[PDB]
Symmetry: C3
Subunit: 422 residues, 3 copies
């Protein structure tokens, strides 16, 4: 009956051939293969739900490509004559800058006692005004030369930015073997800072970032010494992550003002929100999230909260569980650096006359940098959903067909046959 009609292989022999050996043997093979189908399909479905993925890598030359943004800060942060009689500022800036650098601060120290006593008295003091006026600055005396792809550029092409290093200036703000070339005058005789707080090195610190991202110096910025010429070759490396089941991304999350999401952006936004809860003001190093806090509130309100946030781990990053998951698309600019003695014996005496300064000054103040695109200047890494629902529906077809030659229509036939029997 159903054996002659069903397309399930084997069963037709069971009824059609009634020989004892065949009538019994054929059913055994039917049972044997049928149980094999269930195991194989089970393995297939089990593997699918693990959410496997595979990656694709592309590397190419991009003749005309968008140069990134680069921000520069002086390793000496304050004007020498603006801090000679106002040494308290180093501890005040340390406390105030605790938002960006989370390095802890030791209470009862001599420095922290002087600053606290000062803040309680000089409540008018505006740290932002002081640091803006009495810090590093881009000027004809500070940026001796600069060129972008052979076109001269001026200090007016740099946008000012605040950072734990004080005033910082970013270039290119919002071809192989070509890029940005600069020449700085660190002017150690004019800019200084406290060495007792760990600021001993002299030079320029910079970070290369996308124009849409706020630079994050921390302990991550690159360095360049005085008296050497640094050649930096950068390559753009982009990576794409799948959503939570396949990757750690989470496109649902969006930052304030619906701005493009970035892991660093979430952390800054996350911290700013908490500080605005415990205290009614936000530090000026987190610009757009509200009002600026007074000097005193840094010691009383903002400082304890930052310790609490770190202590309770309220700003986790990374996994999708984290408050700041990995971004869907990550853009990175790996760099390799080589050095040459910048002032040559011929050039040393040429610059000495041109800049009207002694040769000793030149060797100790001038920093020369050169950031270029390599030849193979592009690379994309893609995470791919190895198998989709359409892809799985093919694999299950092969196994089911291979061992039994069945089909979804065959299953319906069996169910109908069982229903009649019931």
């Amino acid at each position: 009956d159903f054996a002659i009609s069903t397309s399930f292989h084997g069963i037709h022999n069971i009824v059609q051939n009634r020989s004892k050996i065949r009538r019994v043997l054929w059913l055994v093979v039917v049972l044997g293969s049928v149980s094999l189908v269930t195991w194989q399909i089970y393995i297939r479905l089990l593997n699918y739900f693990t959410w496997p993925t595979t990656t694709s890598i592309e590397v190419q030359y991009v003749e005309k490509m968008e140069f990134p943004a680069v921000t520069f800060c002086n390793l000496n942060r304050f004007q020498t004559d603006a801090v000679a009689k106002f040494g308290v500022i180093f501890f005040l800036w340390h406390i105030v800058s605790k938002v960006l650098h989370l390095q802890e601060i030791t209470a009862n120290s001599t420095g922290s006692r002087e600053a606290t006593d000062f803040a309680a008295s000089h409540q008018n003091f505006s740290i932002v005004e002081f640091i803006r006026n009495k810090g590093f600055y881009l000027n004809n005396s500070t940026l001796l030369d600069c060129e972008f792809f052979g076109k001269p550029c001026s200090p007016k092409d740099f946008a000012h930015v605040f950072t734990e290093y004080g005033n910082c200036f970013t270039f290119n703000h919002g071809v192989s073997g070509r890029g940005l070339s600069l020449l700085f005058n660190v002017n150690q005789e004019a800019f200084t800072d406290n060495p007792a707080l760990g600021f001993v090195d002299a030079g320029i610190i910079f970070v290369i970032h996308s124009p849409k991202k706020v630079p994050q110096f921390d302990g991550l910025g690159l360095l360049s010494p005085v008296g050497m010429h640094a050649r930096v070759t950068i390559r753009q490396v982009k990576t794409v992550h799948q959503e939570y089941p396949w990757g750690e991304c989470n496109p649902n999350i969006k930052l304030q003002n619906f701005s493009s999401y970035s892991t660093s952006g979430c952390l800054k936004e996350c911290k700013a929100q908490h500080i605005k809860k415990q205290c009614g003001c936000v530090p000026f190093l987190l610009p757009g999230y509200g009002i600026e806090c007074d000097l005193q509130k840094y010691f009383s309100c903002v400082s304890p909260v930052l310790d609490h946030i770190e202590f309770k781990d309220l700003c986790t990053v990374g996994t999708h569980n984290s408050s700041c998951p990995v971004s869907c698309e990550e853009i990175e600019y790996p760099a390799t650096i080589s050095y040459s003695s910048f002032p040559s014996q011929k050039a040393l005496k040429y610059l000495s006359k041109k800049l009207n300064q002694s040769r000793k000054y030149i060797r100790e103040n001038l920093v020369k940098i050169e950031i270029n695109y390599s030849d193979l200047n592009y690379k994309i890494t893609q995470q791919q959903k190895a198998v989709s629902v359409s892809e799985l529906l093919a694999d299950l077809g092969g196994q089911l067909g291979l061992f039994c030659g069945a089909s979804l229509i065959t299953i319906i036939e069996i169910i109908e046959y069982l229903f009649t029997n019931f």
Copy 2:
């Protein structure tokens, strides 16, 4: 009739079972699944024609492996006494070297006016002869020490090459922790060049490349300063690209003399052809493509053409559309550089007596380099044709079999049945 014979599932129920509920319901399921097959197969075929690809990465230690070729140039390009009374050469070389470095040249400048007036008069002048004789050279006084895998090597092991930096010498021309060790004497007192043209740094510039490729310094070469010891660890990174439909490669294109194709080689060959069209001679910095041009023709014929070629973008690179597509196989040598103070207080007085020169001279002239193979010194990235025609023919079989249990024979049966009906 055909229902009892066709293997297309479902239809057998339509005719065999004539019950109103079943006779109608079964056809509905047949129609439902049949339309599902077309959508799924359409998605499969649509995805196939996108030419997807997947990559494979292999990393391994190669005990005995072919060391690449390395070429060195002095950052000071001319002998001091050969150019003291012949300062015009700096602008002459700048104009002549415009083939390699495409940096533009400002007309009406004082330097360019003197050179042009000189060229109009000294038409006998042979720039190649001058630069070859009056430039950098490898000698016992310039290459103090050199060793390759523990075997001493001599200046005779270096092959001379012309470059925008003048005379350049390449080593190894056509094991972990071992490689090439060198010690140079830049001799700033003997080699100089114009700082007003942007040559201010002193040291050695070199590039690591395959022995079959002409070095391309441009703004891509690595640097090494005087008075420091540079340790460079290299790793060979090979990548393979599929043909145009799957990748950007194009194996059909081949260079002159059927030489191995390379993106840089195509650019040089492309430029040489155009210059030979507008002008009857080729610059000597493009060696094998014809005759050498006179000094005057550089100012009159070659220089304007290069601007035109860049202006019209006649030498695009990268995509398969480009005149110089990406090579099928790319070999790259990423490098990481570390530095130490080369002359120690003990060695400084040892070299002072050995070389019979003052300690000040040693600190400002000697350059020490060391290029080594890392432990994990190899890596291959392969682009693979994810699905071939054989691979696709399995996926289409699974979907067709799964939802209808049909086969290419089943389709022929339907066509024949329709033909009889027609």
Copy 3:
């Protein structure tokens, strides 16, 4: 008969339809597709046995991650006053240290003749005791400052290790922008070594490695000069290899004491075994493999054997054939280094008073290092068995079903039908 029962498509037409055109044509299509099945399946099986693989890449931020171990050595290896009257030690250490550095040694040289004459006489001499007492040491006078994630650390946190550089000390032995910060005092006035043997540079040499691996300096260690501050950013890059058929790994091999396998560990264990065969003692630079050899046996027994081992290539590495195959899991710490002038003009006079030494001493002795984790501090590369037996059994099902709609049950039916005919 069998045509009406077999599920192999096409054959049913052969018997059922007896029209000359159809009776013959249908069999032709049956034959045509059947031969196509064999070719397609043959291609599938042939491709499977090549053992293809595909790779997956994951990159993420790890907020709290295990910092690696770092070991430091001084580029000057011996105390100046301990070797002034005992200059033979340089050649003795060169011979003894030949186990780690395999650089050959020239017999009949003046140095090797003095050392050999000394060894034959001073057979009591214990090289291990001398180097331990009369070498580099970590001390308050040598490690001026050190901090780990903001927590001060002391010389007692470093574990002593022997190396070709003499005494070496490893930190962290068995968060983004944070790590290890150090300040060394190379004290060139106290440590020296032979420049005639190729030790001319002064500074610090270090290698970053997993805590479970013995450091391998060789020509692979990183460098840091005196008078500059080096910022090292590291990222953990882990790779996994499949077994021999798919990759070069070989999990069966295990080291002595069933310790975790590592390519470098196998080489050290391999060499130690051979030396213990030809000679009855093992060098103390291979610690755990047996007894220490006498001073004389280094010249007589150990030295010739090492040449023989290298000459006969008894310690191959890499491929699964090699005596020391690639490890199943490889952990690597790529690093990028940037530099700044360490003593600023403000800090130079601050440290001069603090350390009670002249400014010239500071510039020539102090080394500052800083090893940090980057933001994207993790990465895993996985090699995957592209197709398993379950995966293959789907592809063979699609091809067989597509062209003939057959199944493993169909094949059995044919075999039984042929048996009856036979």
